[PDB]
Design a protein around this ligand. Structure first.
Ligand SMILES: Nc1ncnc2c1ncn2[C@@H]1O[C@H](COP(=O)(O)OP(=O)(O)O)[C@@H](O)[C@H]1O
Ligand SMILES: [Mg+2]
Length: 436
DNA sequence: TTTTTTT
């Protein structure tokens, strides 16, 4: 049931012994439905992983961290304390030893250390140290034009720069030992549903600011946020918070405040949600952690149904189901430099305990990455500031008419890091081999 | 500056 373009990639991946493939293209191009066809072909032989919970859900797999039991921190290069093989008689060891294919969805969101940790974990567990991924055939799928992987400041950023030169999956050293065969998908849903939108976005992918004039002519209407069924996106947290606060205060009903418990050193700028979180029944929220039992994910939108002491009920938009939310603990990690060997090392210095809930009438563009919305309004505020931020904001909706802007987009807000441009020009040949 | 993954 694949299109001709999808069948081309399906056959190029399944009917060759080559062990490393990348299937890439813009959103709506068929990557996920091709993944399902690959799963049906391989079924027992393949393990499906993704870097986020919502992507793992859409890929019918698990997160990379959960499968390999990686810690939620910087994965230092082949470091035995961050990358631990499974025990001698564990189910995970059997799963890795018998694995033939690893399917990795949304690979553009896989940070370089995550991918490298996969490589090392597979090599060590399978005892094939000289073969990339321990001889497992890796099928990467994803768009290469997204928000960059998260890289905190301080010694962590310096480590990643020193070790890999950057955060992207194509900067991993494993590509120096195996060639990545590339297969592009061009035909998108959007090309059929709104070709004008698809043409504008293609030019913006190419960094062409010319496209902004038509986009601004079509989409600028400052009152677009006042319309029903409209989620508001902002570049920064402060403006989204003010939006949410206004909606919360206008919502009739009795409020309940959830007070975080903070221990040790945890600056409030690093808080994953508000320390004093006030909620009302019916408030639009977004969940902030992945359920270990798979009933909800970080990024799930929903509505507050019940509010009680350290426990609330949320009705999920995704499936209409009810989930009960209790506090989670986040850790603050600091990396200290040893200054005599290379030797940075993590230490947990603080903890933050709070219900994993944030108000969601307004969201940041970063937080809305990976959601598909029916209608969005972009309240630009002081402006977009990150690689891919404009493109990700625009692509949250299916049609240009579903989008509105508070003001014209400026050419300074169309941002792409040159390393991503360089990698794209090299994967237009059909195969890519990282130098060194 | 500026925001976000991962348990
Ligand atoms: N071969 C196909 N047959 C039927 N529907 C398809 C096919 N390919 C894509 N679609 C539809 O197009 C939409 C986008 O496809 P998807 O696999 O989600 O693309 P992407 O992974 O790039 O977002 C999906 O909702 C899917 O229903
Ligand atoms: Mg996809």
């Amino acid at each position: 049931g694949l299109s001709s373009e999808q069948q081309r990639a399906f056959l190029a991946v399944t009917q060759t012994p080559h062990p490393a493939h990348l299937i890439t293209g813009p959103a709506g191009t068929g990557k996920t439905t091709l993944l399902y066809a690959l799963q049906e072909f391989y079924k027992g032989r393949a393990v499906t992983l993704a870097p986020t919970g919502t992507a793992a859900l859409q890929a019918r797999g698990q997160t990379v961290h959960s499968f390999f039991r990686f810690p939620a921190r910087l994965l230092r290069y082949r470091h035995p304390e961050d990358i631990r093989p499974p025990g001698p008689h564990s189910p995970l060891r059997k799963a890795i030893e018998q694995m033939e294919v690893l399917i990795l969805d949304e690979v553009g969101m896989v940070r370089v250390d995550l991918l490298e940790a996969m490589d090392w974990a597979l090599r060590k567990t399978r005892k094939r140290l000289e073969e990339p991924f321990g001889g497992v055939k890796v099928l990467l799928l994803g768009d290469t034009r997204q928000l960059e992987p998260v890289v905190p400041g301080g010694e962590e950023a310096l480590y990643i720069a020193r070790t890999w030169g950057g955060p992207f999956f194509f900067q991993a050293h494993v590509w120096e030992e195996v060639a990545l065969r590339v297969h592009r998908l061009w035909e998108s849903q959007r090309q059929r549903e709104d070709p004008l939108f698809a043409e504008l976005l293609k030019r913006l992918r190419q960094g062409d600011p010319q496209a902004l004039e038509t986009l601004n002519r079509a989409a600028v209407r400052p009152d677009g946020g006042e319309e029903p069924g409209t989620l508001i996106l902002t570049p920064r947290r402060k403006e989204a918070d003010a939006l949410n606060l206004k909606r919360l205060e206008a919502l009739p009903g009795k409020p309940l405040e959830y007070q975080a418990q903070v221990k040790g050193e945890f600056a409030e700028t690093d808080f994953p949600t508000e320390a004093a979180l006030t909620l009302k029944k019916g408030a639009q929220v977004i969940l902030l952690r992945n359920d270990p039992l798979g009933e909800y994910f970080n990024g799930d939108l929903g509505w507050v149904e019940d509010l009680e002491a350290e426990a609330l009920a949320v009705r999920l938009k995704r499936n209409g189901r009810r989930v009960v939310i209790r506090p989670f603990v986040w850790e603050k990690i600091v990396y200290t430099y040893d200054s005599e060997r290379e030797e940075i090392k993590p230490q947990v210095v603080g903890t933050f305990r709070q219900v994993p809930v944030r108000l969601a009438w307004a969201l940041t563009v970063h937080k809305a990455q990976g959601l598909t919305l029916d209608k969005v309004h972009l309240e630009l505020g002081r402006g977009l500031f990150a690689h891919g931020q404009l493109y990700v904001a625009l692509t949250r909706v299916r049609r240009l008419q579903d989008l509105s802007l508070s003001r014209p987009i400026a050419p300074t807000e169309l941002l792409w890091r040159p390393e991503v441009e360089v990698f794209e020009t090299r994967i237009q040949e059909g195969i890519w081999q990282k130098s060194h």
